């Protein structure tokens, strides 16, 4: 199944190996996303002044 | 210490092996949840009119 | 590349091994605050009563 020879074969495909080797970093960025949404709560007070 | 023989042993347990090769896809679905929240912003303008 | 000898080498570094073998559980916990954020939409009705 999983061996030195099995893993080294995906380096020739290049494109898929990059995606399966950067997903870990990607989840941390999707964490900061929810925190960004909270400021909209202040925009609701600005929405009451809208003509 | 992760070997060809150690990995192939979990295929006899069947049920728990699924948890080690499907959760990666499941994180992207928790990525659609945050996108859904924005419509709540327009609902706040419908909530003050609620007779 | 990934081998029995390559994995057993990070046990001498100790600190990095813990970071690469506990975050997987943490993604479920970073999935708890998203459900919590909704009450801020409810706080907008309490903000209209706040003199």
């Amino acid at each position: 199944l999983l061996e030195l020879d099995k893993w080294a074969s995906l380096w020739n495909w290049f494109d898929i190996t990059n995606w399966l080797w950067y997903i870990r970093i990607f989840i941390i960025i999707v964490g900061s996303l929810i925190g960004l949404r909270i400021v909209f709560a202040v925009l609701s007070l600005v929405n009451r002044v809208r003509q």
Side-chain angles (χ1 to χ4, degrees), chain A:
Chain A
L1 284 60
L2 306 174
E3 299 185 273
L4 204 183
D5 185 72
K6 191 74 176 180
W7 286 108
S9 182
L10 292 294
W11 291 54
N12 182 93
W13 295 44
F14 188 75
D15 187 72
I16 183 58
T17 314
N18 298 16
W19 172 21
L20 302 178
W21 181 37
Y22 302 137
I23 29 59
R24 182 179 174 287
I25 293 173
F26 205 70
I27 316 318
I28 305 176
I29 304 176
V30 174
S32 296
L33 231 75
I34 79 89
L36 211 171
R37 303 288 169 168
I38 198 176
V39 71
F40 281 73
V42 329
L43 191 80
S44 303
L45 206 309
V46 181
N47 189 271
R48 182 176 173 69
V49 182
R50 192 76 175 187
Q51 58 182 260

Coordinates of all heavy atoms in Angstrom, one line a residue, chain A residues 37-51:
Chain A
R37 N -16.5 38.4 10.0 CA -18.0 38.6 10.0 C -18.6 39.4 11.1 O -19.6 40.1 10.9 CB -18.8 37.2 9.8 CG -18.3 36.4 8.5 CD -18.7 37.0 7.1 NE -18.0 36.3 6.0 CZ -18.3 36.4 4.7 NH1 -19.4 37.1 4.3 NH2 -17.5 35.8 3.8
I38 N -18.0 39.4 12.3 CA -18.6 40.1 13.6 C -18.8 41.6 13.4 O -19.8 42.2 13.8 CB -17.7 39.8 14.9 CG1 -18.4 40.2 16.2 CG2 -16.3 40.7 14.8 CD1 -17.6 39.8 17.5
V39 N -17.9 42.3 12.6 CA -17.9 43.8 12.4 C -19.2 44.3 11.7 O -19.7 45.4 11.9 CB -16.6 44.3 11.5 CG1 -16.7 43.8 10.0 CG2 -16.5 45.9 11.6
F40 N -19.9 43.3 10.9 CA -21.2 43.6 10.2 C -22.3 44.1 11.3 O -23.2 44.9 11.0 CB -21.7 42.4 9.4 CG -20.9 42.3 8.0 CD1 -19.6 41.9 8.0 CD2 -21.6 42.7 6.8 CE1 -18.9 41.8 6.8 CE2 -20.8 42.7 5.6 CZ -19.5 42.2 5.6
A41 N -22.2 43.5 12.5 CA -23.1 43.9 13.7 C -23.1 45.5 13.9 O -24.2 46.0 14.1 CB -22.6 43.2 15.0
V42 N -21.9 46.1 13.8 CA -21.8 47.7 13.9 C -22.5 48.3 12.6 O -23.2 49.3 12.7 CB -20.3 48.2 14.1 CG1 -19.5 47.1 15.0 CG2 -19.5 48.6 12.8
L43 N -22.3 47.7 11.4 CA -22.9 48.2 10.1 C -24.4 48.2 10.1 O -25.0 49.0 9.5 CB -22.4 47.2 8.9 CG -22.7 47.7 7.4 CD1 -21.6 48.8 6.9 CD2 -22.8 46.5 6.3
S44 N -25.0 47.4 11.0 CA -26.6 47.3 11.2 C -27.1 48.7 11.8 O -28.2 49.1 11.5 CB -27.0 46.1 12.1 OG -26.5 44.9 11.5
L45 N -26.2 49.3 12.6 CA -26.5 50.7 13.3 C -26.4 51.8 12.2 O -27.1 52.7 12.2 CB -25.4 50.8 14.5 CG -25.9 51.8 15.7 CD1 -26.5 53.2 15.2 CD2 -27.0 51.1 16.7
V46 N -25.4 51.6 11.3 CA -25.1 52.5 10.1 C -26.3 52.4 9.1 O -26.6 53.3 8.4 CB -23.7 52.2 9.5 CG1 -23.3 53.2 8.3 CG2 -22.6 52.2 10.6
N47 N -26.9 51.1 9.0 CA -28.0 50.8 8.0 C -29.3 51.6 8.4 O -30.1 51.8 7.6 CB -28.2 49.2 8.0 CG -29.2 48.8 6.9 OD1 -30.4 48.7 7.1 ND2 -28.7 48.4 5.7
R48 N -29.4 52.0 9.7 CA -30.7 52.7 10.2 C -30.6 54.2 9.7 O -31.7 54.8 9.6 CB -30.6 52.6 11.8 CG -31.9 53.4 12.5 CD -31.8 53.2 14.1 NE -32.9 54.0 14.7 CZ -34.2 53.7 14.6 NH1 -34.7 52.7 13.9 NH2 -35.1 54.5 15.2
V49 N -29.4 54.7 9.4 CA -29.2 56.1 8.9 C -29.4 56.2 7.3 O -29.7 57.2 6.8 CB -27.7 56.6 9.3 CG1 -27.4 58.1 8.8 CG2 -27.5 56.4 10.8
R50 N -29.3 55.0 6.7 CA -29.5 54.8 5.2 C -30.9 55.4 4.7 O -31.9 55.0 5.1 CB -29.4 53.3 4.8 CG -29.2 53.0 3.2 CD -27.8 53.3 2.6 NE -27.8 52.9 1.2 CZ -26.6 52.9 0.4 NH1 -25.5 53.2 0.9 NH2 -26.7 52.5 -0.8
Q51 N -30.8 56.5 3.8 CA -32.1 57.2 3.3 C -32.9 56.2 2.4 O -32.5 55.1 2.2 CB -31.6 58.4 2.4 CG -30.6 58.0 1.2 CD -30.1 59.3 0.4 OE1 -30.7 59.6 -0.6 NE2 -29.2 60.0 0.9

